[PDB]
Amino acid sequence: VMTKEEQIFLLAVPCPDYIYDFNHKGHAYTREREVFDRLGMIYTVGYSVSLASLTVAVLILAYFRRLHCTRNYIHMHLFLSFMLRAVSIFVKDAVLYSAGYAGCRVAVTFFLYFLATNYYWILVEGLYLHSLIFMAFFSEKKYLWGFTVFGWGLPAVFVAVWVSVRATLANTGCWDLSSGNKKWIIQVPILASIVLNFILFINIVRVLATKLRETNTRQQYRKLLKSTLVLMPLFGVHYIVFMATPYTEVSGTLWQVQMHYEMLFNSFQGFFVAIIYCFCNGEVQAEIKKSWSRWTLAL
Amino acid sequence: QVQLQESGGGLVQPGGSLRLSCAASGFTFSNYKMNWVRQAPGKGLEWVSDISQSGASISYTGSVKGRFTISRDNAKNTLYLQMNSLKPEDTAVYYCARCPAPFTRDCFDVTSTTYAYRGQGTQVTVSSH
Amino acid sequence: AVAEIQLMHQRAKWIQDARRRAFLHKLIAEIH
Amino acid sequence: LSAEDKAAVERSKMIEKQLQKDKQVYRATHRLLLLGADNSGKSTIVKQMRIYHVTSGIFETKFQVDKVNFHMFDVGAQRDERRKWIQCFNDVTAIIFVVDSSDYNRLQEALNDFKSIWNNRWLRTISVILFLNKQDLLAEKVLAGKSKIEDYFPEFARYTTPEDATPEPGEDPRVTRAKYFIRDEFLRISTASGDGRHYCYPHFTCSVDTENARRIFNDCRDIIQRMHLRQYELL
Amino acid sequence: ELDQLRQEAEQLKNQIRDARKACADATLSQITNNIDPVGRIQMRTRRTLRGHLAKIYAMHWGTDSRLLVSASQDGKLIIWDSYTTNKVHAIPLRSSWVMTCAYAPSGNYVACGGLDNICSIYNLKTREGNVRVSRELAGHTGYLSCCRFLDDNQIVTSSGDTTCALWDIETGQQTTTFTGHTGDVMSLSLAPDTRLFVSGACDASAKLWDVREGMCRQTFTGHESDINAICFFPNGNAFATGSDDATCRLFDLRADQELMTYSHDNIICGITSVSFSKSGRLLLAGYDDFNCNVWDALKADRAGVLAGHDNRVSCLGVTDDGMAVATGSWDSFLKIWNGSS
Amino acid sequence: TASIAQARKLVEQLKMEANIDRIKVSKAAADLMAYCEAHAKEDPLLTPVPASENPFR
């Protein structure tokens, strides 16, 4: 562990004589790299594509003032969280790759905070969608400030608590290295959040069933399947697929496929969400067509 | 001025055949939906049948369904109504009504007693002598 | 386990172990 | 900035905050449009909802159900021509269309009115709540047997009771068949056009039953939820 | 008896048609072909009004062309300053379903009405500066479709009961009644001298009435569907009518015949609001296709298109000096359009 | 009923409308063209106004 098996191993030194190996005579004077590089390239490309698509979608949505609504505001917040997560990941990759420097800890903290905010906004999307059926329908509908506080301050509070605990307990150089169960302080909430979001997804599906049978025919099942497919990226369903898998050694089979699945689906989640909610949306397409027609007529 | 003139009617024996003609002038006949209304003695206006612009969708009321046939001729700008197997309860005055708006599928005030886009109508009396 | 957090922890652990392993290998190559 | 300009700005700000309060009040209150024939029991429903609370032109009734305010508007004094002012109700939460099921002769008029309001250009995105009123009168008329719906509607001869029917346990099967025939006759017209942008909620009303307003409540809730499902393109 | 009267009426109609044919020698478009065409017209949205909660139904410009009144189905009547976009007054309305509004020429009173069949007039120059219901007018048996002030004490209103009324503010009772329409009267236009007014009904008819005398003068039935809007020419000898048949028609009082027809194959939806410019050279008509069209009043050509409304345009007004055109739409936004060099 | 009275009133209205002098449509069209041309320079919509004089800037 670390470079301390030489500084504290001065006893220029004979053989230890208490180790079965390292014969007492005399005196003391690739595949993992390939898979790591492949995963890095895959998730870097995915995050770059997602960032480009999301910033284009944000610009398009901000251009049209009529699209301004609570649902679109929450979508904009989610897109901003995804963009910040991608930027933080890129900065962390640049800094850590290619000893207690302030920049290391700052980059790690920013990456963790942006990841937590992204997960919390993914949860907030499902929370608002579920509220629109049970809480909101027939009740004040605006809760933008409350959801914003929940998605920003609470991740900030828990990240600050984790930073304080790390500084007080170990503070061992860069904070990339994990020390004990302290990392769970970040892992325990976020994963649980995802679980809650998953539950909400199921509830949404239940709603998406109970109305359809009221209005009726295999077209009902086709529409239900389409709605489930377009709602899967929003709720982060793919997280629960490999959430149950604990920490595993790099030289393994389950770990490698889990890492590939995560670095593909999480990377493409932003791109899929942008396509679904900003390119296939009827209102956005209609507004773009109207703007293009007006521009052509004016010119 | 939008006007419609109706021809055909009078005394008719029960179970016979009758032809009602309507000539409309002052507007494009192919653009508007056409309707037939009846007013019985002591009873209000009631919708009978309707035909669309192209005649693809033709509908009748349940009282006379399968008994009356309504058609239109855009080239001659006229409306025809063939009535067969008449009944004494059909003794009434017939009005031909036009859709209030063009290129629409809904008729709102066709059966209205003060509707202006309708003809004077003709009396048909199904009696046995 | 969070995917990104687990990956970064494993990569940092491998780096820390591999620098030590390279040091040990280069120190023992001269001896043997 | 001029003093007069500053006074105008502050007065505009006061007007803006008043309008914001008015908007907050308005969004929490739903609006409903009542339609029906003269012989229909619309007046009885209005009287019941007024007493329970939970020249003139138009009548307004305010009732609160589950801490939710509803304003129901009824036509007070208007001519038989309704092709123009109906466009004023293109943004109402729901349209309660009450139909008298006891008058077979005027049932065709009710069907024509429902078809006209269902296919209206400015009523395409407005859901209509259907109340088949006078259920007791319809049951008594069916049990009497003096008049049959076959003469008025020949299609009733070939009609069959739906499998998914839920009749009252102490109800004659003929009454159930007739009421479901009327319900399906309305449903065929409703489903003939619309493409799913607006929905119909056929309910059987006894004109004295208390649940009716609650039913509307539930119906309106569903509509709002469906509206949300049309915002996310889930339907 | 009835048959003889109907035959006499038909003979009189035929005689009137023969007289109209005899007095018609050349078409308006035939002699306007030698004038310079107006050409393409482009107008930009200088100002946008926001704050209403429901669809805008009607609006009216003031005498000074600075303050305007906007009516929306949310039960609020809002006075807008066209220059600085500041709101002057926000009058709460007892009846939320308001279909028309009017602004007095002196700017001291504002009128509104709708499905309640009551014409409510409020005083904007109260002693304490608080708007209160100055007067309520009752007697119409139909929805109030259009109201226009004549002076500080008289107003002309039209309702759906095929009847127009003249109301005196001091007494609150009708003084002159105009009858003769068969369909619902939609809108009326006052002459510049306030001596005659022409109103269109939902029977493809437009009738001219005298305020002081109180009987119809000319009747025009050149349209095919219900006429929704009508505007008066600046000279006072002509008017224009827009109907659901996607066709505008220009009628002349002295000629007693239609002057020009404005229609095109690409436009098939109804017409909601029409108005003339200061000189009458251009006719602005809002349609159900979420926009307005400015037609050349002489050559019957589409001079320009004003688009940018998310819903149908309900009301269109032109200032007295013609500085800008205010168009209200059901999207709860009122847009001010003007041209630039 | 009032049908007879309404018909008589309509006949009287048609009679009083018939006995009016009608100007030829050509003269009315010429007068309208002259009026439009006279006020053409006073129409801000027909002739755009420079932003210096236009208050809607």
Selecting from F11, F39, F48 the residue whose C-beta is nearest the C-beta of E278 gives: F39
Q: Which residue of chain F has the CA closest to E296?
A: F46
> Which among A132, A123, A116, A85 is positioned nearest to A199, based on CA atoms?
A123
Q: Which residue of chain E has the CA closest to A66?
A: E310
CB C3 within 8 A of CB A246: no
> Which among F42, F41, A297, F46 is positioned nearest to E283, based on CA atoms?
F46
- Is residue E257 in some structural domain? yes
Report the CATH number that the domain containing residue F24 is assigned in CATH.
4.10.260.10
Alpha-carbon distance of E99 to E114, in angstroms, equals 5
H/E segment holding residue E184: none
Contact criterion met (CB < 8 Å) for A36 and C11:
yes
C-alpha gyration radius of chain D: 21
Alpha-carbon distance of A202 to A197, in angstroms, equals 9
Alpha-carbon distance of E337 to A66, in angstroms, equals 19
Q: Which of B87, B109, B110, B114 to mutate to test the interface with D (most CBs of D within 10 A)?
A: B109
**Where do the domains of chain B lie?**
3-126
Domain count, chain F: 1
Alpha-carbon distance of E306 to E312, in angstroms, equals 12
∠ Cα D20 D24 D29 (to 5°): 145
Alpha-carbon distance of A2 to A8, in angstroms, equals 12
The separation between the first and the last C-alpha atoms of chain E, rounded to the nearest angstrom, is 67
Contact criterion met (CB < 8 Å) for B116 and E183:
yes
Give the tokens for residue E75: 């039960």
Q: Please give the domain boundaries of chain A with CATH numbers for all domains.
A: 37-189+247-298 (1.20.1070.10)
Alpha-carbon distance of A112 to A105, in angstroms, equals 11
Interface of E with B (CB under 8 A): 6, 13, 182-183, 202-204, 221, 224-226, 244-246, 268-270
CB D63 within 8 A of CB E147: no
Which residues constitute the domain of residue F17? 4-56
How near does any CA of chain E get to the CA of A74, in Å?
A: 23
Report the CATH number that the domain containing residue E60 is assigned in CATH.
2.130.10.10
How near does any CA of chain A get to the CA of E295, in Å?
A: 17
Cβ-based contacts under 8 A for chains D and E: 87
Alpha-carbon distance of A102 to A193, in angstroms, equals 30
Which residues of chain D are within 8 Å of residue B115 when distances are taken between CB atoms?
A: 81
DSSP secondary structure, E145-170, as one string: EEEEE-SSSEEEEEESSSEEEEEETT
Selecting from D80, D108, D153 the residue whose C-beta is nearest the C-beta of B113 gives: D80
Examine chains E and F and say if they touch (3+ CB pairs below 8 A).
yes
Interface of B with D (CB under 8 A): 46-47, 61-63, 65-66, 100-101, 104-109, 111-115
With an 8 Å Cβ cutoff, is F34 touching chain E? no
Which residues constitute the domain of residue E266? 35-338
CATH 2.60.40.10 fits B3-126, yes or no: yes
Report the CATH number that the domain containing residue D80 is assigned in CATH.
3.40.50.300
Alpha-carbon distance of E113 to E101, in angstroms, equals 7
Cβ-based contacts under 8 A for chains A and E: 6
Domain count, chain D: 1
Examine chains A and B and say if they touch (3+ CB pairs below 8 A).
no
Selecting from E224, E244, E270 the residue whose C-beta is nearest the C-beta of B2 gives: E224
CB E164 within 8 A of CB E177: yes
Neighbors of chain F by Cβ distance (3+ pairs < 8 Å): E
Alpha-carbon distance of E168 to E154, in angstroms, equals 5
Which residues of chain E are within 8 Å of residue D59 when distances are taken between CB atoms?
A: none
Which residues of chain A are within 8 Å of residue C19 when distances are taken between CB atoms?
A: 3
Examine chains A and F and say if they touch (3+ CB pairs below 8 A).
no
Cα dihedral A105/A107/A113/A118 (nearest 10):
-160
Selecting from C16, C20, C30 the residue whose C-beta is nearest the C-beta of A177 gives: C16
- Is residue D11 in some structural domain? no
List the alpha helices (DSSP H) in A211-245: 212-215, 218-235, 237-243
User: How many Cβ atoms sit within 10 Å of the Cβ of residue D71?
Assistant: 15
Which residues constitute the domain of residue D41? 32-231
In chain A, DSSP assigns E strands to 13-14, 27-28
Alpha-carbon distance of B107 to D119, in angstroms, equals 9
Alpha-carbon distance of E244 to E267, in angstroms, equals 11
Phi, psi (deg, nearest 5) at residue E55? -70, 140
Domain count, chain E: 1
Q: Which residue of chain E has the CA closest to D86?
A: E115
Contact criterion met (CB < 8 Å) for A176 and C19:
no
Alpha-carbon distance of D221 to D227, in angstroms, equals 10
- Is residue E197 in some structural domain? yes
Contact criterion met (CB < 8 Å) for E252 and F32:
yes
- Is residue D26 in some structural domain? no
With an 8 Å Cβ cutoff, is D15 touching chain E? yes
Examine chains C and F and say if they touch (3+ CB pairs below 8 A).
no
C-alpha distance from residue A138 to each of A88, D65, D92, D127, D224 (Å): 40, 10, 15, 17, 8
Measured in angstroms, the resolution is 2.7
In B1-129, DSSP assigns E strands to 3-7, 10-12, 17-25, 34-39, 45-51, 58-60, 68-73, 78-84, 92-98, 122-126
| Residue D235 C-alpha from the chain's centroid | 22
User: How many Cβ atoms sit within 10 Å of the Cβ of residue E81?
Assistant: 16
